[PDB]
Design a protein around this ligand. Structure first.
Ligand SMILES: CCCCCCCCCCCCCCCCCC(=O)OC[C@H](COP(=O)([O-])OCC[N+](C)(C)C)OC(=O)CCCCCCCCCCCCCCCCC
Ligand SMILES: CCCCCCCCCCCCCCCCCC(=O)OC[C@H](COP(=O)([O-])OCC[N+](C)(C)C)OC(=O)CCCCCCCCCCCCCCCCC
Ligand SMILES: CCCCCCCCCCCCCCCCCC(=O)OC[C@H](COP(=O)([O-])OCC[N+](C)(C)C)OC(=O)CCCCCCCCCCCCCCCCC
Ligand SMILES: CCCCCCCCCCCCCCCCCC(=O)OC[C@H](COP(=O)([O-])OCC[N+](C)(C)C)OC(=O)CCCCCCCCCCCCCCCCC
Ligand SMILES: CCCCCCCCCCCCCCCCCCCC(=O)O[C@H](COC(=O)CCCCCCCCCCCCCC)COP(=O)(O)OCCN
Ligand SMILES: CCCCCCCCCCCCCCCCCCCC(=O)O[C@H](COC(=O)CCCCCCCCCCCCCC)COP(=O)(O)OCCN
Ligand SMILES: CCCCCCCCCCCCCCCCCCCC(=O)O[C@H](COC(=O)CCCCCCCCCCCCCC)COP(=O)(O)OCCN
Ligand SMILES: CC(C)CCC[C@@H](C)[C@H]1CC[C@H]2[C@@H]3CC=C4C[C@@H](O)CC[C@]4(C)[C@H]3CC[C@]12C
Ligand SMILES: CC(C)CCC[C@@H](C)[C@H]1CC[C@H]2[C@@H]3CC=C4C[C@@H](O)CC[C@]4(C)[C@H]3CC[C@]12C
Ligand SMILES: CC(C)CCC[C@@H](C)[C@H]1CC[C@H]2[C@@H]3CC=C4C[C@@H](O)CC[C@]4(C)[C@H]3CC[C@]12C
Ligand SMILES: CC(C)CCC[C@@H](C)[C@H]1CC[C@H]2[C@@H]3CC=C4C[C@@H](O)CC[C@]4(C)[C@H]3CC[C@]12C
Ligand SMILES: CC(C)CCC[C@@H](C)[C@H]1CC[C@H]2[C@@H]3CC=C4C[C@@H](O)CC[C@]4(C)[C@H]3CC[C@]12C
Ligand SMILES: CC(C)CCC[C@@H](C)[C@H]1CC[C@H]2[C@@H]3CC=C4C[C@@H](O)CC[C@]4(C)[C@H]3CC[C@]12C
Ligand SMILES: CC(C)CCC[C@@H](C)[C@H]1CC[C@H]2[C@@H]3CC=C4C[C@@H](O)CC[C@]4(C)[C@H]3CC[C@]12C
Ligand SMILES: CC(C)CCC[C@@H](C)[C@H]1CC[C@H]2[C@@H]3CC=C4C[C@@H](O)CC[C@]4(C)[C@H]3CC[C@]12C
Ligand SMILES: CC(C)CCC[C@@H](C)[C@H]1CC[C@H]2[C@@H]3CC=C4C[C@@H](O)CC[C@]4(C)[C@H]3CC[C@]12C
Lengths: 150, 39, 350, 203, 150, 150, 150, 150, 51
């Protein structure tokens, strides 16, 4: 009855939600780790306090995993092509929004840890900027849920 | 159709030749002349 | 990776081989020992004739002098570098021009110093370093006008880019020549590091360490020498190149530094420099901080020869031959002054 | 980076076009038009076979020339201060050219399997002829690309060996082992091409 | 009646609305965070007063989220091809308008915060320029809402 | 009653699962090896302690191999297009998530070992960041398993 | 009977195995050799020890050859589309995994050889990292054999 | 009987055998002339001896011309696809082989003219390398003569 | 291709002949070798077109 190519777009949604979120979280983690290593030479005591960027980057991958698992569970043999489009759109939204959020978190956290190596008062501002760069992935997750659950 | 068998064969042959010509043109455009001469 | 292996030798392979062949002619430890064992400058030339140097000093007058030997070594290196540059292409041509900017900086400093003291620029020309010759005629026959000379530098010299650090030509008479020189050198080193990074690949990998160490040593020595002077900390911090590994808070701690103990504490955070500062006893009879930094610089320039497809070989060779010429001049000085005790202070290469 | 910008733009545009074209064909139920069967089948086996022979020879020669210039630049540069390089390190050039010799040998072996059909209908051309064209093309790709990479590798290693010999005579004898190892790859490619075209028969 | 592929462009509209808006907001946040990290070393007490560009980028992301959720709530199985195209156009409009607005916000915020670290009077000018860049995303949202509700 | 090209997507899933995971593991191992070599000249005693990033990249490669063998054993002549698409999605998910994790591990391991030469305390922070980077690939593996064992 | 074009994908599988494994081995040998030759002027007695990474790259080439021989012996003009796809996937897996392992071995071996010239203790660490990079090609061979024999 | 387009591939093979050989010989001539001009300013007596690489580039061009003339004299109205594609393969072989041989001759000659200027003994070594570089294009011509007369 | 060769060779030769007058004949010979490439192109073009 339904087209046989709908499961392809469904799995594309799942794999995108996972892959792009993983790429964003990986970029965030890599940039934040580079910054942490650079800053810890002179200010070792802040090595742990300067790990918030990495946790906030992993939260993006957790968003992507949530959407990917939702899509993978919703997958079945006879999903209408419209449902497959819904799942693909949810996956793309979560994945690419998380990728952008990972870019922002990586840059913000790198700059913030480097600055906090010199100015302790910048930590709260860095945390707020990281929250503002994380709500982007949160919005992507919200849209992905709204599309998938429909 | 957008393509026919003859068009497909011709396009692939012209694509290989375009790759070869692009490689050659790249290596030629990379030629540089000396800006100075020995005293 | 950039895969320079594929295309480096298209343009610069012959020069890579040539410069490596030239480097193979730098005196080794055995040759340095042989030269050290001499008694007179004539015997120094005699022993040196067996090395790659050959008969570079046979023509000149029998009563050899340290000045004559030094000028002949300088002339030989200038000839070799000029040959390489003349046979180089665009990217390596720019690399070699960047190498020469270092001496062009000192030459322009000499020109402005003489001009502000109302001395003929044509008469200042002979004292300039050959590798930084101002062949342009816009900066000649200036009529001893600092404004005209500044305009000439801006119009017809590769230092126009570095002279935008200043604000006007009045800066020439306002700021001290040492501060002008070091601001120019900071700008030049930053631009050189940027160019090497843009080149990327093995060039960046093998060259950025050398420029980074240059920046760090410049920071350390400027701090250690500006302690007793009127050079304020704010105006001193402007002279630290930002290429070094001290850029985050290291240069800042140095700027706030007010004593050699504080400079050493700053250097402690970086082990590579920690060892140099620890070995720099600085008391009579043992290696000084400058000597330790010379040893590290020679080591880095030698490690530059373990990479293959990169331009850093040429900068390393130029610096290593500069060090070798300095070593030979020092050995000749020890022979002439009969101070054989310190004859081992030369930094060996290979 | 103007030329690389042009290549990157062409690549990105082509693959964005391919992505959207595939999405369109799948979604609009026009997949039956995307007849890869019809492509591979109507496209004459002669095209594949002769492209394969041409690649087998041309890419092998390309790798041989790449390596020869890579190592000859270094040989001649080093020999300005130590001419013994020219007499000793010709072995690197010899290897780089053995790459092209393998190329021509495999071109001959592949070309020996060609034969006309006198048919145009795919059912008449048959599995034997279609697979013959495909396998000759694949063998040409294998030999040509393996030879290209082996020649470039031997050239890089030989430039290194010549530079090292310019400074110490007793090093080339030990560094030639890397050249031998790099040479083995061309032999592997030749063996695989021969295996591919072992049971190949056009006619 | 309606083609079975109509909802593809609607899901693409929702996904684009969220993704490009998130990309613009992420670029703005990253640039503003780099500027804040650079300035805070010398002028730390201005971090809170300087967080504004990140808030503007967040507002752009909120525009994108509004349009994406509206499209995802107006997306139905029997979606006419006309309405699917309307939703795709709304999504692209808001997404790319927010992307441009986020680029403007990032550049202007970085420059303005760096300048305000030296010239206090520049703060009000920075706010004015940021509002002028924000109204671009506002116009994108206007057009997207018009198209979606049409 | 299923297409004979159905197995193509599943085979590409297995091939991608191995290939992309291997590329990420190769990037991680190569970058970490360069870092270890650079830092070993001065601080030889830290080589074995610092070999951790290479181990983590190897674990990423093992994730890829696990999913690849699972797909290869799940393959069949009459594999429905649905199962083939599921295996393609799982393969892309694991391969590209492992690729991102390998990039992150490469950058973080390089920076971490180079810094730990200078700052001994940074070792544990580097381990935490590497754990996050590995967790990215673990998420990819989880999604791939969910997709490939439906 | 089976499609006339079926053998295309098995042919390309064998070709891809050989070509990409050859690319990886060639890069490994080239990088390691240009490292060894440059190093040996400084440390002439390390050449034979440092030859090992070249041998690992050759082993990558060997894996590619093995899988290519398997495919070229199991490939017939009338092989099912399924088997042709399996051989294409096995070829891609082995070839690209060997490519990644060859890149990793080249980078690691060159860096480690240069370091061993400076730090003899690093030889064992280099061998460990080289084994870890070689195990990637071994994984690729395992997956390729599973696919080609299935 | 035969397709009206069958002669296109043969015509293009002749055109390629001419054009790519001409490009390779032009590169050889240009690089060798650059080297000779750079050298001559100091060693005018070596111009005639050093003009050899230009001659070998001309020989590459001559091989290209020969194969192009063969194919152009073999083209006929009823040229079958078999002959047409044989000539296409011969043209590709000659053209690309001459291209690469000309590149090698140009590079080696530009190096060796300057080298011989410094070291007179390098002349024979340069000639030895150049003859190999030229017989690469000769191998191309040999394969072309095999093919176009298969 | 012949135009590329003639441009490169002629520019280098005319710039180097200001230094060494004896390079004129070498430049002329190299330019002849570059021109014969265009002449070969013309020969093949005639053979084809007038076929
Ligand atoms: C910029 C660099 C220079 C260019 C280098 C790259 C060139 C790329 C080569 C392009 C040729 C692609 C094949 C064309 C045939 C397939 C078309 C297709 O799928 O549609 C017809 C197919 C089949 O059509 P059909 O079979 O129903 O039509 C009847 C059959 N004919 C026409 C032959 C009689 O599907 C459709 O009907 C879709 C209709 C809408 C068209 C969608 C085309 C996709 C591309 C549109 C957007 C452009 C993308 C680029 C984005 C911007 C740049 C990044
Ligand atoms: C030395 C190499 C130099 C570099 C490479 C450049 C070579 C370019 C050669 C010309 C293009 C050929 C393309 C492939 C088609 C070959 C002909 C063929 O087989 O067709 C027979 C076929 C036979 O038809 P058929 O039987 O296959 O079709 C089926 C039946 N019908 C048609 C009824 C449906 O007919 C044609 O002529 C096909 C049309 C092909 C048109 C291709 C467009 C080419 C555009 C030229 C490039 C752009 C020019 C402008 C540039 C601007 C300035 C830079
Ligand atoms: C950000 C980029 C901007 C987005 C647009 C990108 C450019 C795409 C437009 C290319 C020009 C083609 C216009 C239509 C041409 C007429 C085609 C035709 O007759 O259609 C018949 C085709 C095929 O025939 P059919 O399906 O109508 O007929 C029925 C066929 N059976 C029975 C088999 C089902 O279908 C249509 O009617 C298509 C109508 C809409 C096509 C619009 C273009 C498609 C591509 C849109 C973009 C895809 C990406 C979206 C997400 C992007 C987010 C960044
Ligand atoms: C950039 C790197 C490369 C990857 C992207 C590009 C890959 C493909 C490029 C080549 C040109 C397009 C190929 C497909 C052509 C259409 C084939 C066709 O219609 O048959 C389909 C076939 C058959 O279609 P059918 O209509 O016969 O359906 C079967 C019906 N029965 C069983 C009754 C016969 O089935 C599929 O749907 C196969 C899936 C592949 C087609 C879709 C291609 C996807 C392109 C990439 C976009 C992915 C969407 C998600 C985006 C995010 C990704 C992470
Ligand atoms: C100006 C310069 C000179 C001119 C330019 C020459 C060089 C450029 C030409 C290169 C090719 C570019 C275009 C590629 C199109 C890809 C497929 C398009 C999809 C499509 O609609 O094709 C269908 C057929 O394709 C199929 O059956 C699918 C076959 C796809 C094979 C693609 C292989 C080559 C391109 C990609 C790989 C490149 C690497 C080299 C191999 C059409 O169907 P229809 O309606 O016509 O069908 C009739 C009977 N059903
Ligand atoms: C990025 C935005 C989106 C783009 C989408 C559109 C598609 C891409 C088109 C290019 C878009 C960017 C603009 C680039 C312009 C061309 C490249 C730079 C200029 C140029 O070509 O000039 C020089 C080469 O000479 C020449 O002019 C020779 C070029 C002509 C050769 C034509 C043959 C190639 C045919 C294509 C098929 C081959 C495919 C290969 C993959 C290169 O200058 P430089 O870099 O040395 O100096 C530095 C500055 N130019
Ligand atoms: C996330 C990124 C995207 C990943 C998804 C994968 C994308 C792959 C791109 C390729 C296109 C998608 C593959 C599926 C579509 C295949 C074409 C189906 C259309 C169709 O009905 O064609 C049949 C023939 O196809 C056939 O029998 C063809 C079988 C082979 C199809 C696969 C080949 C793709 C090219 C692979 C090249 C690999 C190169 C490796 C170096 C009909 O034929 P019929 O027998 O019913 O005829 C009846 C005539 N009366
Ligand atoms: C460390 C932090 C990020 C962990 C928090 C993860 C949160 C955001 C995840 C974990 C599990 C998720 C839920 C899992 C399943 C569903 C059911 C679905 O129909 C609506 C969304 C909903 C209700 C999800 C909302 C988001 C959720 C609660
Ligand atoms: C790292 C941790 C703390 C973050 C949260 C991850 C876990 C708890 C998330 C990721 C995927 C999620 C699942 C996604 C989909 C579904 C199907 C739905 O019908 C019920 C909830 C359920 C089963 C979710 C439960 C929570 C879940 C398992
Ligand atoms: C409260 C803020 C912080 C948002 C965090 C929670 C977000 C991500 C999630 C958790 C549960 C989600 C809701 C769960 C179920 C549904 C029903 C569905 O038919 C439409 C979407 C809707 C209404 C979801 C919207 C998004 C949602 C609210
Ligand atoms: C801080 C951020 C999350 C703000 C998000 C924007 C809010 C205000 C927007 C986004 C989507 C909007 C909803 C979209 C659709 C509907 C359904 C309609 O029948 C009543 C209004 C309602 C329920 C809207 C209320 C406002 C809304 C929730
Ligand atoms: C934050 C604000 C200023 C931005 C959005 C602008 C407001 C005023 C615009 C955007 C889209 C508009 C809507 C678009 C379409 C319709 C349908 C029409 O039959 C009645 C008016 C109505 C419902 C419009 C009301 C005004 C509206 C909501
Ligand atoms: C140390 C060696 C074994 C390699 C390391 C990876 C090992 C542990 C991996 C590679 C492939 C994996 C197997 C792949 C497929 C299956 C089928 C599944 O239904 C049960 C698990 C099982 C049987 C896996 C067990 C773990 C496994 C054997
Ligand atoms: C922290 C630990 C648990 C994570 C590492 C182990 C992961 C990879 C394992 C542990 C339990 C596993 C799940 C257990 C059972 C199933 C049911 C099956 O139909 C789909 C896969 C699924 C949903 C597995 C996915 C992978 C999984 C989450
Ligand atoms: C390890 C590499 C270098 C190859 C050297 C060992 C060779 C002889 C071994 C290793 C793996 C082996 C293959 C593993 C799997 C199978 C499937 C089995 O049902 C038949 C034999 C076959 C096809 C084996 C053939 C021989 C083989 C290729
Ligand atoms: C031999 C050395 C290199 C150790 C590495 C193991 C590799 C090369 C080989 C040796 C034995 C092989 C296995 C032997 C038997 C089979 C069964 C067959 O149905 C699928 C392949 C499979 C599962 C092979 C996979 C690859 C394998 C594990």
């Amino acid at each position: 009855n339904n087209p046989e190519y709908s499961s392809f777009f469904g799995v594309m949604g799942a794999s995108s939600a996972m892959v792009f979120s993983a790429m964003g979280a990986a970029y965030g983690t890599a940039k934040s780790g580079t910054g942490i290593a650079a800053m810890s030479v002179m200010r070792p005591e802040l090595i742990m306090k300067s790990i918030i960027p990495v946790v906030m980057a992993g939260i993006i991958a957790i968003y992507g995993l949530v959407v990917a698992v939702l899509i993978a569970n919703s997958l079945t043999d006879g999903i209408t092509l419209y449902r497959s489009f819904l799942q693909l759109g949810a996956g793309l939204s979560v994945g690419l929004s998380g990728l952008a959020a990972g870019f922002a978190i990586g840059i913000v956290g790198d700059a913030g840890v480097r600055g906090t190596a010199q100015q302790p008062r910048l930590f709260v501002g860095m945390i707020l900027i990281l929250i503002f760069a994380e709500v982007l992935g949160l919005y992507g997750l919200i849209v992905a849920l709204i599309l998938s659950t429909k | 159709g957008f393509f026919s068998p003859g068009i497909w064969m011709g396009l692939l042959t012209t694509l290989f030749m375009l790759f070869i010509f692009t490689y050659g043109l790249h290596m030629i455009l990379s030629l540089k002349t000396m800006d100075r001469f020995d005293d | 990776s950039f895969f320079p292996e594929l295309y480096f030798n298209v343009d610069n392979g012959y020069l890579e081989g040539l410069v490596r062949g030239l480097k193979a002619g730098v005196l080794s430890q055995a040759d340095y020992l042989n030269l050290v064992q001499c008694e007179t400058l004539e015997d120094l030339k005699l022993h040196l004739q067996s090395t790659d140097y050959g008969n570079f000093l046979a023509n000149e007058a029998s009563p050899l002098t340290v000045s004559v030997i030094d000028d002949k070594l300088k002339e030989k290196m200038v000839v070799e570098f000029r040959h390489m540059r003349n046979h180089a292409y665009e990217p390596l041509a720019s690399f070699l021009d960047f190498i020469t900017y270092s001496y062009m900086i000192d030459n322009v400093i000499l020109l402005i110093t003489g001009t502000l003291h109302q001395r003929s620029i044509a008469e200042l020309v002979p004292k300039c370093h050959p590798l930084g010759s101002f062949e342009q005629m816009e900066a000649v026959n200036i009529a001893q006008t600092p404004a005209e000379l500044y305009n000439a530098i801006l119009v017809d010299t590769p230092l126009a880019a570095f002279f935008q650090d200043c604000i006007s030509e009045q800066d020439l008479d306002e700021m001290n020549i040492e501060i002008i020189r070091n601001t120019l050198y900071k700008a030049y080193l930053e631009s050189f590091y940027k160019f090497c990074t843009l080149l990327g690949g093995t060039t960046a990998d093998a060259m950025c360490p050398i420029l980074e160490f240059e920046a760090d040593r410049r920071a350390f020595i400027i701090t250690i020498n500006s302690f007793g002077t009127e050079l304020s900390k704010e105006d001193r911090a402007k002279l630290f190149p930002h290429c070094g590994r001290l850029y985050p808070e290291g240069l800042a701690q140095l700027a706030r530094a007010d004593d050699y103990e504080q400079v050493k504490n700053v250097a402690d955070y970086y082990p590579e420099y920690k060892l140099l500062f620890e070995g720099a006893g600085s008391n009579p009879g043992d290696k000084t901080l400058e000597d330790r930094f010379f040893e590290h610089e020679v080591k880095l320039n030698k490690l530059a020869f373990l990479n293959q497809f990169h331009f850093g070989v040429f900068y390393a060779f130029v610096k290593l031959k500069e060090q070798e010429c300095r070593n030979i001049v020092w050995i000749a000085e020890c022979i002439a002054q009969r101070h054989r005790a310190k004859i081992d202070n030369y930094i060996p290469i290979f | 980076t103007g030329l690389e910008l042009l290549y990157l733009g062409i690549f990105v545009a082509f693959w964005a076009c391919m992505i959207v074209v595939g999405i369109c064909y799948t979604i609009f139920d026009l997949g039956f038009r995307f007849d890869v069967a019809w492509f591979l089948t109507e496209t004459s086996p002669f095209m594949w076979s002769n492209l394969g022979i041409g690649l087998a020879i041309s890419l092998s020669v390309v790798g041989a020339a790449w390596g020869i210039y890579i190592t000859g630049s270094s040989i001649i540069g080093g020999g300005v201060k130590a001419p013994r390089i020219k007499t000793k390190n010709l072995v690197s050039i010899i290897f780089c050219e053995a790459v092209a010799i393998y190329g021509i040998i495999m071109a001959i072996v592949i070309s020996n399997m060609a034969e006309p059909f006198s048919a145009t209908d795919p059912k008449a051309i048959g599995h034997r002829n279609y697979h013959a064209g495909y396998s000759m093309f694949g063998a040409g790709l294998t030999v040509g690309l393996s030879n290209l990479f082996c020649g470039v590798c031997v050239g890089i290693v030989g430039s290194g060996a010549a530079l090292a010999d310019a400074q110490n005579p007793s090093l080339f004898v030990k560094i030639l082992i890397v050249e031998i190892f790099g040479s083995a790859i061309g032999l592997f490619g030749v063996i695989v091409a021969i295996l591919q075209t072992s049971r190949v028969k056009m006619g």
